[PDB]
Design a protein around this motif. Structure first.
Motif, short mmCIF file in Angstrom:
data_model
loop_
_atom_site.label_atom_id
_atom_site.label_comp_id
_atom_site.label_asym_id
_atom_site.label_seq_id
_atom_site.Cartn_x
_atom_site.Cartn_y
_atom_site.Cartn_z
N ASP D 1 -7.88 -23.42 -5.57
CA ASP D 1 -7.07 -22.54 -4.73
C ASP D 1 -6.97 -23.10 -3.32
O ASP D 1 -6.15 -22.65 -2.52
CB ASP D 1 -7.65 -21.13 -4.70
CG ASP D 1 -6.64 -20.08 -4.28
OD1 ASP D 1 -5.43 -20.41 -4.21
OD2 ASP D 1 -7.04 -18.93 -4.02
N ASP D 4 -2.22 -26.34 -1.90
CA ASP D 4 -0.93 -25.70 -2.11
C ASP D 4 -0.38 -26.14 -3.47
O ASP D 4 -1.09 -26.70 -4.31
CB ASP D 4 0.02 -26.01 -0.96
CG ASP D 4 0.21 -27.50 -0.73
OD1 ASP D 4 0.85 -28.16 -1.57
OD2 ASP D 4 -0.26 -28.00 0.31
N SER D 5 0.91 -25.89 -3.70
CA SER D 5 1.52 -26.21 -4.99
C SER D 5 1.48 -27.71 -5.27
O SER D 5 1.21 -28.12 -6.40
CB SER D 5 2.95 -25.69 -5.03
OG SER D 5 2.98 -24.28 -4.86
N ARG D 6 1.76 -28.53 -4.26
CA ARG D 6 1.72 -29.98 -4.44
C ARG D 6 0.31 -30.46 -4.73
O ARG D 6 0.09 -31.25 -5.64
CB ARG D 6 2.26 -30.67 -3.19
CG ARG D 6 3.76 -30.84 -3.13
CD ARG D 6 4.15 -31.71 -1.96
NE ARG D 6 3.47 -33.00 -1.99
CZ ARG D 6 2.51 -33.38 -1.15
NH1 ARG D 6 2.08 -32.57 -0.20
NH2 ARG D 6 1.98 -34.58 -1.28
N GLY D 7 -0.67 -29.98 -3.95
CA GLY D 7 -2.02 -30.47 -4.06
C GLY D 7 -2.62 -30.92 -2.74
O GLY D 7 -3.59 -31.68 -2.72
N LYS D 8 -2.04 -30.46 -1.64
CA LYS D 8 -2.54 -30.75 -0.31
C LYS D 8 -3.37 -29.57 0.20
O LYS D 8 -3.01 -28.41 0.00
CB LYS D 8 -1.39 -31.04 0.66
CG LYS D 8 -1.81 -31.35 2.07
CD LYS D 8 -0.61 -31.46 2.99
CE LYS D 8 0.05 -30.12 3.20
NZ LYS D 8 -0.84 -29.17 3.91
N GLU D 10 -5.14 -26.69 2.33
CA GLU D 10 -4.78 -25.78 3.40
C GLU D 10 -5.85 -25.69 4.47
O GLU D 10 -5.65 -25.01 5.48
CB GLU D 10 -4.49 -24.38 2.84
CG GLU D 10 -5.63 -23.76 2.06
CD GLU D 10 -5.23 -22.46 1.38
OE1 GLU D 10 -4.04 -22.08 1.48
OE2 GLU D 10 -6.10 -21.83 0.76
#
Ligand SMILES: [Mg+2]
Ligand SMILES: [Mg+2]
Lengths: 72, 98, 55, 55, 171, 104, 67
Positions: D1, D4-8, D10
């Motif tokens: 979690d 983000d959606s891409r995989g970077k 937060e």
RNA sequence: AAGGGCACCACCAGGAGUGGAGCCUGCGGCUUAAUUUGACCAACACGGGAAACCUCACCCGGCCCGGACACGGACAGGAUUGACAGAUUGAUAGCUCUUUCUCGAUUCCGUGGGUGGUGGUGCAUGGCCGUUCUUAGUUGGUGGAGCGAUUUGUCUGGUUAAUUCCGAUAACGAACGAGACUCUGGCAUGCUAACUAGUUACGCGACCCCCGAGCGGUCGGCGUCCCCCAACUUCUUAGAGGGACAAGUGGCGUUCAGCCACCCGAGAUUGAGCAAUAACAGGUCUGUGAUGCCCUUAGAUGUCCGGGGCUGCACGCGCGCUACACUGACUGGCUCAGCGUGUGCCUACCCUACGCCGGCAGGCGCGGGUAACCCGUUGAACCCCAUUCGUGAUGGGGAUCGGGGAUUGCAAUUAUUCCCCAUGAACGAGGAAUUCCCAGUAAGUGCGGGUCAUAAGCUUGCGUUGAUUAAGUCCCUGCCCUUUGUACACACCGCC
């Protein structure tokens, strides 16, 4: 150069060549009485324009113009 | 791995003519740049001298894209008992005009 | 592995016939002046070869 | 979690590794070998073939 | 001539040869106090000079390693016998060679000296040998996952302009 | 043989090239052999423009690498044979010479 | 993975015994039941193999077949 | 939170634009066997990433070991190695099968152990790079204040591009950064020189002349180092030098630092390169025989070969190119550049003059050039001069699509590229928003290089034509400093 640059080079070389020939072979007192008209009409007739160009930089299309940047 | 006997003796006799031997790291080169007239490629030169290095007879160094195999004192005598050399014949690097 | 097709595909041209002379990479190769050198490698050896940043 | 959606991530400052954090912590204060020091540290073949094929 | 090569490709080829020779010698004589290489090339013959702190080690037994190295670079670069030479020369004031100093740090850190002990030891050596200033930076991971960088500097140091090119030796 | 030679000097740095040109001309003048002043070809500027970054990330910053090649021609005309007259090249590292016949 | 095909079985050589394809009769009369390669590079040592409709050299002595 | 300062990646005043259209390309999404993947100001023509094969990392299949070395087996009475013909296969992979030869210690099988990987982790690392920041900031010594960490120096103010200097002044004297520096542009009829740059003069010429010009005019015609058979460096090139310093005058200012104007001058602010203390878990393990660890390692995530894919489309976004027209389009003529490339170790691939053939894309023979020697006096485009068109989605625009001809390559279909003849689509200056920019600049306009067997709508540079507005400000957007607050110090992505 190009068309305009060759025009300016020709007219400026004619003025400089006549002035120099007049200086070398006849009195410079009478050189002044034609040189003063030349400089009071256009200084570029006896002094070359020093501005040539500016190198392009790797951030844009030209020397100072930069490419579009986008934030979103 | 597999070589003809002529290839193995030719490679070893060059390695004993002089204590060094180079080889560009290119397994697909049709012939070795040196001793190409023996019809043995760079590939068989590569694996023959890595097997010498694993056995300790040769020390290996690698520059940009070339190998720089050298002959060790331990490997000197092993080449003698492989190619049947008496204890008089020495490579050029070991002795020159002396 | 068989000698018929181990290397059969022709590579007399194209990006795969050219590799960096230092690290054998096939990307960003500089062939100008016969350099034949991978790009990041050239930056590493730029002063060693003789190229100098003047401007 | 944590991505983000891409995989970077937060939270880059929130270290996802339990062993180490954002700030390096000296082991034993910097003592022992293989470690940063402390203030205490501060204070001929061809002719042979010729004879062989000669006879 | 057509057999000849253009001057631009010729000078590029020489720079490639110098770089590969230096890189090979660095990977070869790293443990032998390597400092640098100087090559003087004439159409008759070429001379190679390896600058190194310990010539007694770069030279082989009765000169074995010099003959060995000049042979292996002759086979690599395709030089004729009399067109290749190989000389070893000592380096005066070795404390002013950034390559040589960086090698001694590598030896000490490989052995297991403390970073502070080794870096301050070389720092005193460089200043002792006579320099306006020096700066050693060691970065990486030691005993832990997080990596650290330590910087040890003293004396004067310049960074900008042309003088950084021929006043500061960097390795 | 009557022989004339053309010695061509090429270097990357100008100070060495001017030095080897100077003492060659001085050698010719000391040998009373007539010689032309060294004519300078325009410098060849080997320009390469790569990118500073080793990956695709950055602000697209390009590094400019310049190499300069300086080339000089010096002409010797001796009435006698010339090769035996001048035999010393007096060269330094970084610069190379080439001898050509004036007719070749 | 999950190969729909099964593993391919490599060839195992028959490991046959000694050649024994030429004999001697009547206190010794040499008799070969195999053809000879006559090519200069083939040599006399190699023996042409026998097949039901052709003969093929051990080296590449081409292949002599009868139509 | 307050106060100062600075900036066209902030504004003002404006210019050209983008966002509106078509198309090229890169992202996201959707589909797919695969549509490999990283990156989300400081990613999105970025990975020098313009991929037919290779590249290639993705998918579908098929070869090979290129599994060293050590030990144990088997084996010169054979460990093992290759293979013709058929089937078999995409394959003329003896890959497998029938089939017998051949190879002769080089291998093969088992046990340990290698090795390789464009496989993962950039949040394990090095190095490089980007950004904060190219703003102006940063740190000792001595001295003063402090019990002390620390502080002053490094500051109210003026000035500067700049803690750049001047000034008050418990500071004095410094160091880094800035500057200085290297390169570049402008000027030297001053010097050094040049048949691989030439210029003048002259000698032959060729034509126009003859009204007579006659030391007439044109010549990129031939020659004068074709070495006795001219000189000189102005133009070309490149070296040592010089030249510019707020230097001179007037004004403003503490009349100091400096600022404004003007004369003479080529120039009174030419552009770059380099670039501090440090931070960014910023990007890169897919640049490396840089690299730890994990994973795979013989039905391989190794390597090779074939084919497909990386291009795929209801859609959204970013960098761009061509346009909407008469300040124009077509046709013809005239006519001016400078960067800079050019025949290869592996590497099989160069730039092109001239002639002939074709309408063109091109082809065929002769050559020159490893290059100030040949392309080349780089006959560039815009522009200029004439003709047609005439406000019509029109002779604007050239998307889409049919047919045909070549070149490159082993291979052109999912069209490589180019050419010819046909169709002629949206687009009539583009909402909210938004970018870049102060002088040879913006913009119009073409040309080299990088990519390249074939290739530019990209990039990197070059040259041509050539402006409007401004010499200011903190309104917007940020950033820096000083003060201030703090229970933060892993430092607000904090603590709680
Ligand atoms: Mg500076
Ligand atoms: Mg049409």
């Amino acid at each position: 150069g190009g068309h305009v640059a060759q025009i300016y080079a020709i007219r400026q070389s004619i003025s400089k060549a006549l002035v120099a020939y007049y200086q070398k072979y006849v009195d410079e007192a009478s050189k002044k009485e034609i040189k003063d008209i030349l400089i009071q009409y256009d200084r570029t007739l006896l002094v070359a324009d020093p501005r040539r160009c500016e190198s392009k930089k790797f951030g844009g299309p030209g020397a100072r113009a930069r490419y579009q940047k986008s934030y979103r | 791995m597999l070589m003809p006997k002529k290839n193995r003796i030719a490679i070893y006799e060059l390695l004993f003519k002089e204590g060094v031997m180079v080889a560009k790291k290119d397994v697909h080169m049709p012939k070795h740049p040196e001793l190409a007239d023996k019809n043995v490629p760079n590939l068989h030169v590569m694996k023959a001298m890595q097997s010498l290095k694993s056995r300790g007879y040769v020390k290996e160094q690698f520059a940009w894209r070339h190998f720089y195999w050298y002959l060790t004192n331990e490997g000197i005598q092993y080449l003698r008992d492989y190619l049947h050399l008496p204890p008089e014949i020495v490579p050029a690097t070991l002795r020159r005009s002396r | 592995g068989h000698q018929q097709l181990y290397w059969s595909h022709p590579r007399k041209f194209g990006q795969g016939s050219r590799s960096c002379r230092v690290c054998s990479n096939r990307h960003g190769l500089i062939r100008k002046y016969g350099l034949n050198m991978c790009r990041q490698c050239f930056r590493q050896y730029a002063k060693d070869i003789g190229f100098i940043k003047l401007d | 979690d944590g991505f983000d959606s891409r995989g970077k991530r937060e939270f880059d400052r929130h270290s996802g590794s339990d062993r180490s954090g954002l700030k390096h912590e000296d082991k034993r204060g910097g003592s022992g070998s293989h470690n940063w020091g402390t203030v205490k540290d501060e204070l001929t073949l061809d002719e042979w073939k010729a004879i062989q094929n000669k006879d | 001539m057509a057999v000849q090569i253009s001057k631009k490709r010729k000078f590029v080829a020489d720079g490639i040869f110098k770089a590969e020779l230096n890189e090979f010698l660095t990977r070869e004589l790293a443990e032998d106090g390597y400092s640098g290489v100087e090559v003087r090339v004439t159409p008759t013959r070429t001379e190679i000079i390896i600058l190194a702190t310990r010539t007694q080690n770069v030279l082989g037994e009765k000169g074995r390693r010099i003959r060995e190295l000049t042979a292996v670079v002759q086979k690599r670069f395709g030089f004729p016998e009399g067109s290749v030479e190989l000389y070893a020369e000592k380096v005066a004031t070795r404390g002013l060679c950034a390559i040589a100093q960086a090698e001694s740090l590598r030896y000490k850190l490989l052995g297991g000296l403390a970073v502070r002990r080794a870096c301050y030891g070389v720092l005193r050596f460089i200043m002792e040998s006579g320099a306006k200033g020096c700066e050693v930076v060691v970065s990486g991971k030691l005993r832990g996952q997080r990596a650290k960088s330590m910087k040890f500097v003293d004396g004067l140091m310049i960074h900008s302009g042309d003088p950084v090119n021929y006043y500061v030796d960097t390795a | 043989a009557i022989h004339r030679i053309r010695i061509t000097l090429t270097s990357r740095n100008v100070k060495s090239l001017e030095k080897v040109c100077a003492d060659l001309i001085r050698g010719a003048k000391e040998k009373n052999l007539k010689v032309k002043g060294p004519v300078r070809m325009p410098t060849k500027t080997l320009r390469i423009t790569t990118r500073k970054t080793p990956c695709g990330e950055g602000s697209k910053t390009w590094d400019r690498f310049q190499m300069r090649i300086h080339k000089r021609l010096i002409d010797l005309h001796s009435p006698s044979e010339i090769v035996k007259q001048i035999t010393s090249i007096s060269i330094e590292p970084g610069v190379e010479v080439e001898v050509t016949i004036a007719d070749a | 993975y999950t190969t729909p095909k099964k593993n391919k079985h490599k060839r195992k050589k028959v490991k046959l015994a000694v050649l024994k394809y030429y004999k001697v009769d009547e206190n010794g009369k040499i008799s070969r039941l195999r053809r000879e390669c006559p090519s200069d590079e083939c040599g006399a040592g190699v023996f042409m193999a026998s097949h039901f409709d052709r003969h093929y050299c051990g080296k590449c002595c081409l292949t002599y077949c009868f139509n």
